[PDB]
Amino acid sequence: TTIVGVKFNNGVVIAADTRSTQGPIVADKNCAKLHRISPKIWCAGAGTAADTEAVTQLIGSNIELHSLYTSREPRVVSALQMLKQHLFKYQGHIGAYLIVAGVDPTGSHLFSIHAHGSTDVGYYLSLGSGSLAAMAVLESHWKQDLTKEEAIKLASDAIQAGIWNDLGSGSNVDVCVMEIGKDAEYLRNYLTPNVREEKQKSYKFPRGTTAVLKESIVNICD
Amino acid sequence: TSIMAVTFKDGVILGADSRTTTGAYIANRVTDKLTRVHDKIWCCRSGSAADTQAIADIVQYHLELYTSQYGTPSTETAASVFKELCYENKDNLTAGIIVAGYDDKNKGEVYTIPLGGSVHKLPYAIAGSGSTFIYGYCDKNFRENMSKEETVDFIKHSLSQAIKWDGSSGGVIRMVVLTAAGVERLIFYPDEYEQL
């Protein structure tokens, strides 16, 4: 995977590529590595696919219950603390590597969490196998005081570095924009720069090509 | 890492580099390794980032609860709570921690807690991978009851050297000043400290 987070003026943006791998094989050409923890707190996850989905839902569930119990909008630092303490308890065996971002009554926030449970704060971050390709771009183009549109470009540029230069990353760019005072906008397949070319030939077979031994109607009813 | 804490005339100063490593890759070049566990009790963290954060969070929690029931804890007490954690979980922890705080009775104090969870009260303390390279320097240049400016210089010069030789240290030099006057955060960038 490649994943990033970039702070801007009024908020924060995260992005991720969309490739899943089983060894050298591409298991999924278009999976969603951007997760909603709460409406205005989103998560990008690299590492063990099931772990990032499961840990993200669990904490999303508990955050919802907490938000209801307190009559308050959830804060990013609560997701951060809950995620980190859970991951620490599991001593690294839950392989989730996350960039957590969002807006809340306190402001806009950007964090990363490694699987053993340490957290980092920054204006720009990247994680995953593509993180060095992305970080090269971020270190080259990031500045203090980015506008929303500059931040989006910077983020998806960083994801693109991963897509092209990292064999662990490919296909599309997903983005999510969390601006203060506005709804989060989740931009699924924001960029699609890897459209399969038209195939040379249609492999649709003459009907009857396949030798059959038996048929029968299956009973799905009651 | 490179970290240290130094007592002086008016209190104590903590200093640290800002590098986190994942092998030879720098995962974070602007880390904050100086962490608050109470208004005027802070610690420097070295070793595992996850272990030291988890420890500092628990200690902050104990001291918040201490405060609620019995008032401001002494620096010695804070160091004791770190020890208890580090000693009792010595098999599972990679944490080298320096504790530093300011009382009005006791002035500045420094306690260092190496890997096994032993405790050592000292005039100053150095630790982290980069500290090996400055034992000579620090032993030769430290005196008691330095001024604030002298102590900032001692720390700046020392960590400068540790950062120069240690590949696992770098970025900015952060310091935290602890006196009766409050709490002051200092930062020094490469272009300044490198050519000292």
Binding site: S118 | T1, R19, T21, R45, S46, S48, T52
Partner: peptide, 4 residues
């Protein structure tokens, strides 16, 4: 894992 991240060291210091």
């Amino acid at each position: 894992a991240x060291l210091x």
